[PDB]
Amino acid sequence: LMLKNQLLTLKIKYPHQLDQKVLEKQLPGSMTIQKVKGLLSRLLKVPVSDLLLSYESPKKPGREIELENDLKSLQFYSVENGDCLLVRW
Amino acid sequence: EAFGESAETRALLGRLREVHGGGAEREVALERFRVIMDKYQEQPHLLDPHLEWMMNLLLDIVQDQTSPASLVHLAFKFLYIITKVRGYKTFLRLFPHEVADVEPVLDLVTIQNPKDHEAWETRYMLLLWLSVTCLIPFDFSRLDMSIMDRILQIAESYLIVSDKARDAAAVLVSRFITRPDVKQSKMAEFLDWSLCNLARSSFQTMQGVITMDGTLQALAQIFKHGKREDCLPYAATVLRCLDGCRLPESNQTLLRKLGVKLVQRLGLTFLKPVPEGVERVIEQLLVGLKDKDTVVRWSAAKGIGRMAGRLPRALADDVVGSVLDCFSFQETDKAWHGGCLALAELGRRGLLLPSRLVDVVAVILKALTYDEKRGACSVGTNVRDAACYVCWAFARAYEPQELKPFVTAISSALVIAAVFDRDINCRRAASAAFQENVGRQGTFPHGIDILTTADYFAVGNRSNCFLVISVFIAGFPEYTQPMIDHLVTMKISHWDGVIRELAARALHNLAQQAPEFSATQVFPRLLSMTLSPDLHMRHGSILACAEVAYALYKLAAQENRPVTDHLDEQAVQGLKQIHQQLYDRQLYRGLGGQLMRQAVCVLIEKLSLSKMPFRGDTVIDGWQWLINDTLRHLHLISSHSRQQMKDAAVSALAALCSEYYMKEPGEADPAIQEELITQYLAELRNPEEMTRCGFSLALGALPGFLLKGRLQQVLTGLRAVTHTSPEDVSFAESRRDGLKAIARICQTVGVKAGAPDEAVCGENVSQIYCALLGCMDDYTTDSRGDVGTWVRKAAMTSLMDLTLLLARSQPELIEAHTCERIMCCVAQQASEKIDRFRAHAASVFLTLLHFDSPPIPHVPHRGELEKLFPRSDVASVNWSAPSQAFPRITQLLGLPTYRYHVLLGLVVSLGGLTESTIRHSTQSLFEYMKGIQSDPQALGSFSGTLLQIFEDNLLNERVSVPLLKTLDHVLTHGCFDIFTTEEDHPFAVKLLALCKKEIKNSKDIQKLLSGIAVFCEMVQFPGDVRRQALLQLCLLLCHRFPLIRKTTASQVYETLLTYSDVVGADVLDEVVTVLSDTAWDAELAVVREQRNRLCDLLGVPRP
Amino acid sequence: MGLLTILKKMKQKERELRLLMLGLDNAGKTTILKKFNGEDIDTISPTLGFNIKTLEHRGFKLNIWDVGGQKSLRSYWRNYFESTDGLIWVVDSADRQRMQDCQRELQSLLVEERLAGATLLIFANKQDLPGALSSNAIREVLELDSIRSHHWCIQGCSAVTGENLLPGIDWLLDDISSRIFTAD
Amino acid sequence: MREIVHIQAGQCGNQIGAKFWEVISDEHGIDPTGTYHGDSDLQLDRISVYYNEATGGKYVPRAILVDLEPGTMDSVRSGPFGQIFRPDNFVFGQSGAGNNWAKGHYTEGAELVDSVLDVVRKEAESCDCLQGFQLTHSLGGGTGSGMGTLLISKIREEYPDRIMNTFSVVPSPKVSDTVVEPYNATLSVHQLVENTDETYCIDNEALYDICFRTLKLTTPTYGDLNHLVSATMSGVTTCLRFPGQLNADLRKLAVNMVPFPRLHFFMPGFAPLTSRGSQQYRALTVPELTQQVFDAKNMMAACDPRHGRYLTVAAVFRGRMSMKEVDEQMLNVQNKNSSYFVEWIPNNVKTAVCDIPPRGLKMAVTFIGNSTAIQELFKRISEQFTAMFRRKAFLHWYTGEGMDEMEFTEAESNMNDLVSEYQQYQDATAE
Ligand SMILES: Nc1nc2c(ncn2[C@@H]2O[C@H](COP(=O)(O)OP(=O)(O)OP(=O)(O)O)[C@@H](O)[C@H]2O)c(=O)[nH]1
């Protein structure tokens, strides 16, 4: 309701680059996957075409559901608060 | 083929103990096993050699003394699956059958609960296993409650259940009581119990019906697998008790079936391998033969056949007579089917006497063509199948010397049924019967010739059975007249138009082999049958008369003769009173008359192609009046059969005008020509759309000699009628048909220099291309939808229809600017989003670019287009699929010429409404831009053309919102990174100015959101552009729609979290805290202070 | 219900075939059955019950039912006369002290009503044993010419070498296939 | 008193039919024996529409169980509510089409349709005011879909002035592994676009995704997908088996939800997504349910109603809620100025309330729409069908058995025309 009841606090990981630490970011719930991909591209300086995002909730360890469709939102994939976001390139 | 799932199934069976622990993996394994074992449900014999070890892996676990309940339950389920896949009769023989497996399986069955619908399979297969173990030669006394008592109790407990265990219990009872030591001990008690249960159960009670079914099945199995010298004493009382059960007068099919089975087993037992009680069973079976169900009649026929196979000759003759008596006209189709089944069962064993052949054969003549229209659909398919089965059995029933006289009544009956029927099963049965008769007796004429052509696969296709196979079989004299007679006395009088048309085409194809018979004995009947009360008959009587006339005209044309060489003065006289005797009987009135509208029309074209001697008679005037009335009253016809009737009328009118309307070679009667065109063009302004379309199509189908001296008038009329007038804005079909007629005229008149008012030349082609280009641009919309597209396609087909004409004759008339505009329009159409229209435009472009006879002059970028569209990648490229069309069409943007229209057409699919199309278009655009993302010239030109397209398409919502969405998607990807370097970029200031006026005062949440997203994405450009974007965002934040406010706040937060250089370090945190602690969907009074504080923090002016 | 469903069932029933090989003990039933399929014949114990053997020959899926020849079992052979198309009778040639008995059991089997319609096949076993009455001598001791209601054809064989076994198999498969098209 | 004759075809069809029958029997006060043990008068009001009164006041399902394999029939007969069914309505063979539509429409289908029509007529005779037929099958095999299309064509030649409902289930490469599946999902459409009035599409890819993401299940099974199909079927037939302000039976529902003769593919949904295990869940509210039912995550089809124009929409509520509240919430939802304003919700949206709620839940809502987004599903099959039709690899099995290239070309043309009409109506606007 205050624009702070929608933001999902997710921790980002980098399996490819293990030297990097962990960063926990609050992203809007209705934020499309395309916007998150563009943000990650502008941050890590990696092109958007070479990016693969996945979400993994803590309730189901070991699972890794891919995010293919870029037009959908994070809420469509049942992304709850406190889910890990893996990025591969 | 072989068992490929050998190792897989072995591993699946081995991995069992470590699966039953849970529930998910167990269900997965069960589903996998079922899917693997169901593949051999059609060819189960493949599992024969692989069924010995599999069972060995499923039973040893059941006999283990340390196995849990779930494991044995899963094993029993797998065993039941294997048994219901292969067959218990062929699978129980491999089970243990020693005397040490009788107490481990009988006592094991006493550990199951009959009220457990979860583990029920275990209670089924085990009864079968007990029946298997009961086959040992040893006695039960040496092994000793006793075992026989427990077995009887278990059987009398599962026989009264509504689960699948009833069949297993009945099988066990049948295999147990029929033993040496069990017959003289436990048999009368079970019989008395069954009699009491039958005299204590009902058909209305759900439990009573189940008990009756169970006891009847048990009795039937006992009498089948029982002795003849032991069951006869009790058979009398069994039949006496069954007679009172009132099974025939019950509302259950299974009960009646079991009763018929039990009464035919009793009858068989009464006889030896006539006493009292046989007549009772005979009459009961004769009465039951007239059932509604198919299983009851089949069982009754089987029982009657089995009884006749053991009775004297007089009894067999009486049974045959009683069966034949069930064929009178007063009977029903069920009685006929039962009689046919009984006759087949009797002939299968060879019991019928030759003296009956004089009658039975006749019954077949009326059985192989049983067709009684019962309301909507007709009946008689099962009757035809039974007749075919009887004919097949006749191959072995009688001898050839006895059937000799009936070799043309059975070989011609089989030929007519296996080629001119409506069901494929009946045709296949007839073909099989014919093959069996040819293989056994071999007396039919040309049996091998009919078997080679009419094969098991060729007979499946019905359309081929009425053309290729029909003519091949009728080529012989023995199948020339009967086939046509049957087609005229049956197939033509059908209740389906498709069947009537098929029969008419078959008669047309067959007339070429017998011109005399099809013009002396077939024409007189069909000519008089056109005056019957029935509509379909008259419709099949007009079609048959039109096909024979066409065939006779063609046959004559071979000898340079007329069609009157075959038709006498009485034929042509009666063919001229067809349109007159309908108009007189107002037959064309009503929906029934619409059939006569499609009939007489077919009679006008055919007769118009034979050059009949009707020139200068009232029949031509009558046909013209009928055609005009049919073309004018088109709105009174259903939309389903609206195009077919219109096309038929247009073809008939064209044929009439080309044949009859012709004074001298290359000329026409001035009077009739002036009379036609007058009304033809006057009706083009008819407020009705259907009439306008019909008259336009009629004008477009006129020949060339009639358009001499009056082509300019028709041209200007068709040009003025195809316009988006203020009174006819939603007239899409009218313009479509007008363009179609214009194209047809341009194609039929050809080209001829120095002749504007006769053919196409340099004085009207410029007015033809202008009208085509004007009609091309059409994006009308109404409640129905985007119907304008229906016209756009019709324009494309026209632009080509003319381009290939002038290119083949006087190519110099084709200008350069006109061809360039046509190519640009074709590219724009191919860049559309619809699949069908996109594929059509792509095909038109490929045909226009890959014409070489001569090639078409003035094609912008011919070499580049040919290189980007190879000749081999034409049929394989699926233009209908966006994936196989967008990456192949986006390459046209590289060409300067194909950059404006291509981009304008691509903007609608990039910002469209479909998720798959938008994704593919965006991917193609990104792949195309990745190659021109370095050189600033390409990006600058792209930005310039995009701004021009957006500025020439402002407030056209059709293109503003798609263009805004495309801009947002491109900015989200970041294709203008080099432009972000300098401040106040030209494409970054022009677009901002355009977007503000575009959404300015917008009451659409669709274009408002796009503008908000564009403004949020445009913040990357530093300078005054970012300040203006922030000011506009802060201004629109105070909209009157809470949804707009909250979406704008979310987008602002997103673009702020994305770009970090938009706000300082000690200001960004405060801005984020303010945005996180504010309600952007509540009363604007409190939101005003937050907006003011945000503007003061970010430096945005305070309006 | 038509030819597409009835013919599919008749072709399968004709392929399958059943053969009940009866006889007294010590005759050579189990040994001959094992030799037919080609297995060991060095250890054969008395069959205290009944066994079934599925074989494939010339496409004819046969199911041989071998029942023990003990006297106690003679009172239970009636449970194997269901759908019996043939009856194989093994007669011991090297034992004249019990040939007459073999005739008795051969006279009651033909009288059975369920065994009717089948074909009889007599096999004189132990013809490699000195003192083994020939097939001509056995043709009269068992009274073969007296039979008329059913077909028959004596043919001596041997369970050791395994000769004259398959030759008689073809004659048996041909006689049943000759009447399989039409029974009457 | 409009009666409805239920028919089942194929393994999945029979399974979903039995599941729906059991669910409704567990919600209308009917016990397995077939005796009514209820505590209300809202159950035995429209019970004659799904049951027949027999001796002793017993209610009997009017379902005809047809197949070509006996395993599923025996499993359904020996289930919880198996004895309640009529053993005289169990039609089944021993072979099966074999995943081939030609063998299930011509080879074996015609041999058993002759007997199935007898039972169909017997069941339709007891119906006083016959309303039509409702088949339940799939579109990924030869037996099920073939027999379904055959029966529909037969019911369109014997019962032309009758309603024809088809709760087809579209397959998914995720659930099945056969390569000819696209074919079974193509020709059937020809029969389901020309011989049908309503077609409730049930995608097997959307249900699998919902079970893998929402339910967070390790390995979703056919019992988890049959729990969802049964819930959707029970929610769709709410107004048909219970009274209310929305008295739209089979025919009236088709007259109020079929705005076009050819376009009639719906997209049912269900906001309270309950798993096959437990069913206890907080009692949602009216606005929360209205907002969660319109979400694409709570849809049974793999289509986004947002990406397309809406044709007809209907919402049926079943809980301790008011119809006045349902109408105040709907009026607020369709107002931009209001804070409760949302998109993808036009003004043509009916409303209904059910006094008797679904089992396990106290407040539920079921949405039935007809947006053009369903076209996105059809195209998903086109790319999987034509890609093989151009090669004619497995086309021999159909040609040599009965079919022909003409039928395939006609079906492809019909599918293309349907897709074109859908894409054209997607941009339908009038002022
Ligand atoms: N010399 C010789 N011995 C044989 C021949 N055939 C069988 N035998 C032996 O005869 C004995 C009895 O053979 P089986 O096959 O066990 O007897 P059976 O007739 O089946 O007898 P039952 O077990 O009572 O049914 C065994 O020692 C066999 O090896 C043969 O051709 N020659």
Ligand SMILES: Nc1nc2c(ncn2[C@@H]2O[C@H](COP(=O)(O)OP(=O)(O)OP(=O)(O)O)[C@@H](O)[C@H]2O)c(=O)[nH]1
């Ligand atoms: N949702 C769902 N789909 C099922 C179920 N069982 C089978 N299917 C699907 O049904 C489709 C076709 O298989 P079935 O319906 O079992 O086949 P059939 O109709 O009996 O046909 P034949 O295999 O030819 O006998 C496949 O796509 C399966 O995934 C089920 O319980 N639920």
Ligand SMILES: [Mg+2]
């Ligand atoms: Mg032995």
Ligand SMILES: [Mg+2]
């Ligand atoms: Mg199946």
